[PDB]
Amino acid sequence: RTTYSKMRSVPDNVPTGKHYLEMGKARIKLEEL
RNA sequence: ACGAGAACGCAGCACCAGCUGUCCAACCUGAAGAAGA
Numbered sequence: 001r002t003t004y005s006k007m008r009s010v011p012d013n014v015p016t017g018k019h020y021l022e023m024g025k026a027r028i029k030l031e032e033l
Numbered sequence: 034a035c036g037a038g039a040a041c042g043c044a045g046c047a048c049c050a051g052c053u054g055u056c057c058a059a060c061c062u063g064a065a066g067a068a069g070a
Contacts, residue, residue, distance in 0.1 A: 004070045 011020045 002069060006070090008070055010070095
């Protein structure tokens with residue numbers, strides 16, 4: 001129950017600069033066997 | 034003062050010998066420790 005609007009992104013910061021990284025972003029690669 | 038008197042149907046003998054209550058069978062199936070703004 002919040003009087004808010006549509007959902008927003010959930011970034012983070014990491015060194016120094018504020019390097020915005022998408023939370024939970026993973027690169028998925030596959031191979032046989 | 035009896036077709037009667039006396040006379041254990043009794044003695045010894047293991048209901049006993051051999052034989053698996055065993056064979057086959059997944060405690061298994063699905064599920065983001067996760068999301069406001």
